[PDB]
C-alpha cells in the first residue's frame, strides 16, 4: 500500500485471464496493478546501485611541500644539478639568473639555477568507470487491505544477468517479474567522480582535462603524480635560492566546475543512481485473492480520518470496525444519491476486509469515484455510514 501519495503513479489494468502486464518502473514513480479476480498490488523501484567500479585516474587537489633545495652555477659553467632532480617525488624548475662578482662568479651574465622540492598529496579525488552489467535494481511490492501506513509485503533484487525474480506475498500467493525491454539512461561516457565525501557523474572528456596533478593507476607503493607543477609554483629567483610555494586547496574550484553535473549518493562501496526505467512483465497467475469465503460484516463503522482526494482523483478512506464479527468483508460502494444503492464508481482496493477478530480494529481502502456528486457508503442497512463527495 505504497504509492498512495506518490505523484507519479500509473494505474495498469490487466486482462481477465493470462497474466501479462507490462509495467515501467521509474525512480520517484510507482504503479498500481489491478487484475480481474486478483488483489491490487503496488510496485515501486526504490534503488539502482552500480557495484565494483574500477578506478581510472586520481587527481590531487591539495598538496604539501617538504625538504627543498637549490643549486646554482656561474655563466659558462653548464646547467645546475641536484641529486633529487632525478627523483619522481620532486618537482623542479630550471631557470637562468643574473650572476656577477657580487654572488661569487668571475663573469657577468646569466647562470643556471635549479630548485627541487619533495611533493606530497594531502587530499585527492578519484574517478571510476561504471559497467552496466554490475547494476542492481531493488524493487518493492505491497498489496491492499492494510491500515494507515506505507511510511504481507515483499521485496526483490534484480541483476542484468539475473533479471527474473518471484516474490511470495503471504496467502496472496506469488508474482513473478521478467524485467528488461528498455533500460539504460547512459554509461561508457561518464566516470563516477568522488571528492571529499561527495560524488558526481562527470563527462569523460571534461575529466580528462582537469589541470591538477594526477596518477593513472589504482594504487602502487607510493604513487607517482604527473604534472605536479600544477599545484607548486616557483617565484623570485635570487642568484642561489628560489622559494617554492604550494597552491591552496582546489576543492572549491572543482565544485564550481561541477555546477550543472549530475550528483549521486553512495551506499556502500556501491554507487546509488537516481535513474530508473526498467520494464517488467509480471506474471500473477499464482495470485489468489485472500479469502472470498468471508461473510459481510454485520456491525457498524466509523470514520477515523476525513476522506481525502489524492492527486489522481481517487479517494482514500479509513474506517474503524466495532465488533468481534471479524474477520469479514467490508461492505463498501458509492451510491448516486441515491436511488437505491446501485454501484456507480469502482474500487481501487480489491475485496476490502477486516482482518482481526477483536474488537475495534482499523482498515483502509481506496475508491475511484465518478465525476460529479456521489456518496461514499460503508456498511449495510442501518448503522451504515455515508459521506458526500464531489470530484473535480
Amino acid at each position, epitope marked *: 500500500i505504497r504509492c498512495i501519495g506518490v505523484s507519479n503513479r500509473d494505474f495498469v489494468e490487466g486482462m481477465s485471464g493470462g497474466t501479462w502486464v507490462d509495467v515501467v518502473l521509474e525512480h520517484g514513480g510507482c504503479v498500481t496493478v489491478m487484475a480481474q479476480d486478483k488483489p491490487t498490488v503496488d510496485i515501486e523501484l526504490v534503488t539502482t546501485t552500480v557495484s565494483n567500479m574500477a578506478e581510472v585516474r586520481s587527481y590531487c587537489y591539495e598538496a604539501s611541500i617538504s*625538504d627543498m*633545495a637549490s*643549486d646554482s652555477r656561474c655563466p659558462t*659553467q*653548464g*646547467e*645546475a*644539478y*641536484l*641529486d*633529487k*632532480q*632525478s*627523483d*619522481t*617525488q*620532486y618537482v623542479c624548475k630550471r631557470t637562468l639568473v643574473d650572476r656577477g662578482w657580487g654572488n661569487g662568479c668571475g663573469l657577468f651574465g646569466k647562470g643556471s639555477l635549479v630548485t627541487c622540492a619533495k611533493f606530497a598529496c594531502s587530499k585527492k579525488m578519484t574517478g571510476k568507470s561504471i559497467q552496466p552489467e554490475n547494476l542492481e535494481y531493488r524493487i518493492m511490492l505491497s498489496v491492499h487491505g492494510s491500515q494507515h501506513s506505507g511510511m504481507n509485503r515483499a521485496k526483490v533484487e534484480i541483476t542484468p544477468n539475473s533479471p527474473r525474480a518471484e516474490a511470495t506475498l503471504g496467502g496472496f500467493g506469488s508474482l513473478g517479474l521478467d524485467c528488461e525491454p528498455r533500460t539504460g539512461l547512459d554509461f561508457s561516457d561518464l566516470y563516477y567522480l568522488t571528492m571529499n565525501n561527495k560524488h558526481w557523474l562527470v563527462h569523460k572528456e571534461w575529466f580528462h582535462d582537469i589541470p591538477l596533478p594526477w596518477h593513472a593507476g589504482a594504487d602502487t607503493g607510493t604513487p607517482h603524480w604527473n604534472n605536479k607543477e600544477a599545484l607548486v609554483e616557483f617565484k623570485d629567483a635570487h642568484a642561489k635560492r628560489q622559494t617554492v610555494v604550494v597552491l591552496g586547496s582546489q576543492e572549491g574550484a572543482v565544485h564550481t566546475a561541477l555546477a550543472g553535473a549530475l550528483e549521486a549518493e553512495m551506499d556502500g562501496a556501491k554507487g546509488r543512481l537516481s535513474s530508473g526505467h526498467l520494464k517488467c512483465r509480471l506474471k500473477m497467475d499464482k495470485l489468489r485473492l485472500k479469502g472470498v469465503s468471508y461473510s459481510l460484516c454485520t456491525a457498524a463503522f466509523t470514520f477515523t480520518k476525513i476522506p481525502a482526494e489524492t492527486l489522481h482523483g481517487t479517494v482514500t478512506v479509513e474506517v474503524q470496525y466495532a465488533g468481534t464479527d471479524g474477520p469479514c468483508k467490508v461492505p463498501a460502494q458509492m451510491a448516486v444519491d441515491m436511488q437505491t444503492l446501485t454501484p456507480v464508481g469502482r474500487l481501487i482496493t480489491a475485496n476490502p476486509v477486516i482482518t482481526e477478530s477483536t474488537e475495534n480494529s482499523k482498515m483502509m481502502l481506496e475508491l475511484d469515484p465518478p465525476f460529479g456528486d456521489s456518496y461514499i457508503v460503508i456498511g449495510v442497512g442501518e448503522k451504515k455510514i455515508t459521506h458526500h463527495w464531489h470530484r473535480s
Partner: antibody
Amino acid sequence: VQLVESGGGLAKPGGSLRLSCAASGFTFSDYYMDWVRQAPGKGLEWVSRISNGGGSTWYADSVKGRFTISRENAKNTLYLQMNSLRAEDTAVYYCARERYCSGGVCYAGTKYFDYWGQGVLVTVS
Amino acid sequence: PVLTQPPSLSASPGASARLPCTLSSDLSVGSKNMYWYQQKPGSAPRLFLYYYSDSDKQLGPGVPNRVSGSKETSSNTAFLLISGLQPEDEADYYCQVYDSSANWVFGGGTRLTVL
C-alpha cells in the same frame, strides 16, 4: 645476470689495449655502464661512463683523448679502447653497471653501481 | 669536487663506530645521495648502503640491519653508521657521490679494522 671481463695483460708505454666486459642475462641496451680502475693498494678512481645507446660518453680527467669507451648493444659487451697507455694506468679494472633508470627519473634518484665486474689486471711498463 | 674520508680507524665489538666522509664546500651534503660500497681483500665491491635521509634509504642485497645513516650539515659531512661491531668487518668502505661536473667521486677509503 653476469659480468666477466677480458683483455688484460702487459703493454709498454705508448702501447694500446682493448678491454672487453661481456654481459648477459639482462637488456644490455637499457643500462648506463661504468669503468672504474684501482692501482694495487691505492684508492678508487672512476674512469669512464657510457649511456644506454652510447650516444654520449664521459671520462675522467686523467684519461680523455686516449681512452674511448664504446658499446655495441647487439653483442651485449662493454669495450674500453685504451690508446697511448702510460705508467700510472697500472691498475686493476672493473666494469660496473649503473642502476636501472627507466625514464631518467628512477624511483628514488639513485643511479649507483649495483653489480660489478670480476676485475682484470692491467700492468703498464 | 673532492671528498675526504680518513685513511682508517679500528673499532671493537661492544662499542659503536661512526665512519665519516668530509665533503668539500662546493657541495651541500644535505642534498647529496650517499653511496657506500664494501670491498674485501681480492674480491670486487658490491653495494653496501644508500642514504639521502632517514626516510629516503635502502641497503644493498645481503646486508644486515646493524648499518644506517646520519648526515650533519654543520660539518658538511656524511656518516656511515656501523654499530654493533664484530671482527668480521674486513672491508674497505668507499664513500661515493655523483656530480654533473666531476662525474663520479670516491673518498680516500677506510679499512674497517677491529681490535
